[PDB]
Amino acid sequence: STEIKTQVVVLGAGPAGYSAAFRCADLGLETVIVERYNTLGGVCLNVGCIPSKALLHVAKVIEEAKALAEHGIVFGEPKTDIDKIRTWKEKVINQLTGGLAGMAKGRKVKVVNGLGKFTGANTLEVEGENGKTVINFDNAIIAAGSRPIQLPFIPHEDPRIWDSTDALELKEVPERLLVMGGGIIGLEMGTVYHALGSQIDVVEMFDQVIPAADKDIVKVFTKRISKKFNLMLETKVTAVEAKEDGIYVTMEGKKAPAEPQRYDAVLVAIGRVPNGKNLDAGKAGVEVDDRGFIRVDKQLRTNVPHIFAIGDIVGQPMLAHKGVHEGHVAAEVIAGKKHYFDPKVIPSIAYTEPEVAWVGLTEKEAKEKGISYETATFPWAASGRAIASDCADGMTKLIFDKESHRVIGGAIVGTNGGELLGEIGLAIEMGCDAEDIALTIHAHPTLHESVGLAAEVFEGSITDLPNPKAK
Amino acid sequence: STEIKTQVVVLGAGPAGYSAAFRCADLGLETVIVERYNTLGGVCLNVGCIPSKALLHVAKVIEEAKALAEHGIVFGEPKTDIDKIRTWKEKVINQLTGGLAGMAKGRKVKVVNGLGKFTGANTLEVEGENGKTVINFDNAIIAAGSRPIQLPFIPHEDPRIWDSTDALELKEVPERLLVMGGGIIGLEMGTVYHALGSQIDVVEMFDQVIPAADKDIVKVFTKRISKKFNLMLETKVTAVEAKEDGIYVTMEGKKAPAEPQRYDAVLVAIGRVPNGKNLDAGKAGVEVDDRGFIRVDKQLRTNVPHIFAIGDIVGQPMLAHKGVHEGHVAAEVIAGKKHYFDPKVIPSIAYTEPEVAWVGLTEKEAKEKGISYETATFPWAASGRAIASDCADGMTKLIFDKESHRVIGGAIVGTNGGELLGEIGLAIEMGCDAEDIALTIHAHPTLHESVGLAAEVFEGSITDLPNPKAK
Ligand SMILES: Cc1cc2nc3c(=O)[nH]c(=O)nc-3n(C[C@H](O)[C@H](O)[C@H](O)COP(=O)(O)OP(=O)(O)OC[C@H]3O[C@@H](n4cnc5c(N)ncnc54)[C@H](O)[C@@H]3O)c2cc1C
Ligand SMILES: Cc1cc2nc3c(=O)[nH]c(=O)nc-3n(C[C@H](O)[C@H](O)[C@H](O)COP(=O)(O)OP(=O)(O)OC[C@H]3O[C@@H](n4cnc5c(N)ncnc54)[C@H](O)[C@@H]3O)c2cc1C
Ligand SMILES: [Cl-]
Ligand SMILES: [Cl-]
Numbered sequence: 001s002t003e004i005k006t007q008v009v010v011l012g013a014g015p016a017g018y019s020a021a022f023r024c025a026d027l028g029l030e031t032v033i034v035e036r037y038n039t040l041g042g043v044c045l046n047v048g049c050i051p052s053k054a055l056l057h058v059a060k061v062i063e064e065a066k067a068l069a070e071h072g073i074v075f076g077e078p079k080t081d082i083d084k085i086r087t088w089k090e091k092v093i094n095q096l097t098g099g100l101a102g103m104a105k106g107r108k109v110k111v112v113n114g115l116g117k118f119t120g121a122n123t124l125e126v127e128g129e130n131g132k133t134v135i136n137f138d139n140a141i142i143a144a145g146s147r148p149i150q151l152p153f154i155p156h157e158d159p160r161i162w163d164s165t166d167a168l169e170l171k172e173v174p175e176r177l178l179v180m181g182g183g184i185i186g187l188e189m190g191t192v193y194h195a196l197g198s199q200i201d202v203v204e205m206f207d208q209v210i211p212a213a214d215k216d217i218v219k220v221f222t223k224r225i226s227k228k229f230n231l232m233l234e235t236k237v238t239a240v241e242a243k244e245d246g247i248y249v250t251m252e253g254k255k256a257p258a259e260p261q262r263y264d265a266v267l268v269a270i271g272r273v274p275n276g277k278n279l280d281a282g283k284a285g286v287e288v289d290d291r292g293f294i295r296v297d298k299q300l301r302t303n304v305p306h307i308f309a310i311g312d313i314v315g316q317p318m319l320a321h322k323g324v325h326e327g328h329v330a331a332e333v334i335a336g337k338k339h340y341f342d343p344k345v346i347p348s349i350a351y352t353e354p355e356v357a358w359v360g361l362t363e364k365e366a367k368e369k370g371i372s373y374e375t376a377t378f379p380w381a382a383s384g385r386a387i388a389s390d391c392a393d394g395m396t397k398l399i400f401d402k403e404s405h406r407v408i409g410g411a412i413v414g415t416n417g418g419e420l421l422g423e424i425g426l427a428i429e430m431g432c433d434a435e436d437i438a439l440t441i442h443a444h445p446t447l448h449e450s451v452g453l454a455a456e457v458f459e460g461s462i463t464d465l466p467n468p469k470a471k
Numbered sequence: 472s473t474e475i476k477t478q479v480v481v482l483g484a485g486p487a488g489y490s491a492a493f494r495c496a497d498l499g500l501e502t503v504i505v506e507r508y509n510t511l512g513g514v515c516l517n518v519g520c521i522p523s524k525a526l527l528h529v530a531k532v533i534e535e536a537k538a539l540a541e542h543g544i545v546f547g548e549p550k551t552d553i554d555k556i557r558t559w560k561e562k563v564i565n566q567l568t569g570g571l572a573g574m575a576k577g578r579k580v581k582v583v584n585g586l587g588k589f590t591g592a593n594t595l596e597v598e599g600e601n602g603k604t605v606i607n608f609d610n611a612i613i614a615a616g617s618r619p620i621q622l623p624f625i626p627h628e629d630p631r632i633w634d635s636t637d638a639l640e641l642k643e644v645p646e647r648l649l650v651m652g653g654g655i656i657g658l659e660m661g662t663v664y665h666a667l668g669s670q671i672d673v674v675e676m677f678d679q680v681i682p683a684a685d686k687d688i689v690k691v692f693t694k695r696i697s698k699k700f701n702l703m704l705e706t707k708v709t710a711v712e713a714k715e716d717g718i719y720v721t722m723e724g725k726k727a728p729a730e731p732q733r734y735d736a737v738l739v740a741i742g743r744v745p746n747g748k749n750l751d752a753g754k755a756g757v758e759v760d761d762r763g764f765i766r767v768d769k770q771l772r773t774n775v776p777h778i779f780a781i782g783d784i785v786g787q788p789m790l791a792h793k794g795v796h797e798g799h800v801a802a803e804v805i806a807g808k809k810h811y812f813d814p815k816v817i818p819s820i821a822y823t824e825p826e827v828a829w830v831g832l833t834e835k836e837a838k839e840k841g842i843s844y845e846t847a848t849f850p851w852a853a854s855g856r857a858i859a860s861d862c863a864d865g866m867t868k869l870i871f872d873k874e875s876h877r878v879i880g881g882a883i884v885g886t887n888g889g890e891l892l893g894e895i896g897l898a899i900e901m902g903c904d905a906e907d908i909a910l911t912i913h914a915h916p917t918l919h920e921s922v923g924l925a926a927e928v929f930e931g932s933i934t935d936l937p938n939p940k941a942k
Binding site for chain 2: 015018019022023025026027028044045049050051053054057058061062064065067068070071072073074075076078079080081082083084085087088092095096099103106107319320321322324325327328343345346347348349357382384385387388389390416418419420421422423425426427429430432436437439440441442443444445446447448449451452460461463464465466467469470471
């Protein structure tokens, strides 16, 4: 029963949403953000990328410290206080949310807290702390994100059945943990809890973890990870039963045990689904597909031209950077600029150890597309830096169009591997060929020089590896 | 004496030398390498880049392990065995040497061990393990490297007066160590020994460590390091005297103490000089300058057209990657290709913690060149990744031509900062502008996305910082 009139309303304050809102404000538009939770930053900041990366950094340091022992530096076994780790995680998060609130204030962007739902083509109704707020807008930006997949046969109401948020709460270190899903989130959480002392089982229906990534990359990764996790591929969960002494899980498939297994906790990390069906978007005339996605064009417009949608809710890949860039474009289009969201590439990174990172076309995709392509790889066993840094199990891979010589894809498996994507990404966006990359002088000794070296393998000029293109 | 005939003789088996030799072989030329010492890889592999990076990795892990205590993971004080660390260092060197030997064998490149000197324009004489060998060549490639600077008033015959090789031998951990020279090598060794327990003093004649780098970058580094090291800037060593209980060093300048200071060891890391005067190059008609450089053109030719020179011995910067690329060009030119060595940029990295890395023009150089430029920086205090990884003091800086918007230089201070140079390097080589970089989608949350964000700061679209370019 309180009414507001604004130019732009943004539904959701995640990466996509707040980036869109801030861009609108910087472009001189009157902008209001609606968010059901009490802080900004959405899933990414509060229960996603950031806390997971904090805990993963902790895990990495623990394992490195232990790995120093054979080289003459012996730390004891660490004394660990989970409450303190949790407190630190919360500190990084609170620092960042404080930052976002500060920036919203600085850009004079009003934040309305509560559940927003459309009531008309130009009207969004918010139910929150201050009662009901009716927001009349010229433009709306839908950025309401996604949520974890739940399965009907699983008692998701038992506290020992976790999703990613539960896992990131760090309630305890379960003696035995099952991760359902060999995707990125599952493997990352597995990494975290393994470093803390948990015994890790991973169950995955596909024949490979991180299924979109190439076989050769994932092979290095799997070789590394099979020493610490019990990987059960091409296997599925058929039943989950809560009992007093634990969660009993029945599996069927190639690596399934005969008997149901007892776990102290089960992380259900099957995937995520969009929140498009929860907005009464139809009342604004907006089309929502059967899977809950709100599909948009290259200017991020829904079927209703003055209503935009960005981020996870718009489609895959569900990644923060995609949402940020989409938000920027939507804001710019609303401001009247003729901009489009049409990136050649979108990078993906699994912050496991070693990291698995890739951008552009994978070899799988290249073979299905049927274009003449050639791969070039540099093994980290040949890298001075990787050996000197005790991380020789890695590989840098570039994929080239055979005729044009343009780089069309790249991948790294290795410590700090993700940090190498930038160059590759830039290279693809600029339409670089192998010669461009190879002739650029990369610093030695670094991990990223492998990018250059891979290019050299293609050029046939490589001298840090045997050169089969020699004569 | 034994006499042999070859197409190409390469004097020196360092990065430059073996890269040139391997490239010549890959191009179908009969090739012989001459090396006075019994190992391959030269300074870089044996007493330079590789061992220093190994020890620095050890130091970094020790410090991170200690830093976890504040977050709830408490390792004890480490129990350290210096003999075992040294053994590990030696192991990385040996593995890599083995690799190089394997590659030389595979390319059918013969290695003649001994001291090489020119006797004529087409004759090089080697005195070595297999006696004296006379090599008649069509082309020679001089790659005989550099050596540490010594000072006449310093008793360099005392075992407590070190150069970098001594430091890398790791014979003991001196309670108190003086590093003379605030260059990269000195700071790296200071980092290693501080991590091992040494108290570190650094003397530098200039008003900043790493004088070649911009002041703001080094300011960020200096703030981190001034708590761990006693930095004496604008200070000079006037006397060094060996006594029974230690080495007494007298210094003058603003933060130098009045009285001579006692150190258990002194590392002399003032710089390196080329080995050009020690080859009898004059007997081949080759011109050597007064300080020992053998100056060369863009095809790496000396004043004698069939004689080439590459690496440290030809000029600054004395870095491995420069030498490798020069070696490739020299080999290609000898094979009859119209190739040139003329890179737009050559990257530099100090592997301190945080790392200090830069490529292209610094602000000093841009001013000195008279270019109208604009800088754009992203502070790591605003990076989710840097905060979550406990490395928030960093900074990423891009320098753009103000009119063309082309990137002309870049720099990073921060953990893993060096790994970010590749993208920047590539961007400058490709003549990218701020928009090219900004519109490339960088993965979140990473350290390298800062590069993209820095570009956004220039473009005026940044939403992860306040945007003073806003409307
Ligand atoms: C554990 C985990 C790790 C991840 N790791 C990475 C990673 O490393 N890199 C990466 O790029 N991505 C990662 N992701 C995914 C990343 O978090 C998402 O892609 C990103 O958060 C999407 O941003 P968004 O703005 O589209 O949606 P969200 O971040 O989900 O924001 C949507 C916001 O809208 C609010 N909202 C929803 N409905 C309403 C409503 N009706 N009214 C008002 N407010 C509403 C929600 O509360 C939420 O704050 C990870 C995700 C998880 C769960
Ligand atoms: C401690 C330290 C750290 C360093 N860190 C880095 C770094 O991080 N990154 C980087 O890029 N660079 C670094 N450098 C420098 C790098 O090591 C050199 O730039 C590189 O080794 C130069 O290669 P080169 O082939 O030109 O010379 P060298 O590697 O010195 O090779 C010359 C070789 O020729 C031999 N030789 C000399 N005279 C004769 C003769 N008359 N007959 C036969 N053989 C002869 C020598 O024994 C030597 O093996 C570092 C150097 C040091 C000392
Ligand atoms: Cl299932
Ligand atoms: Cl029961």
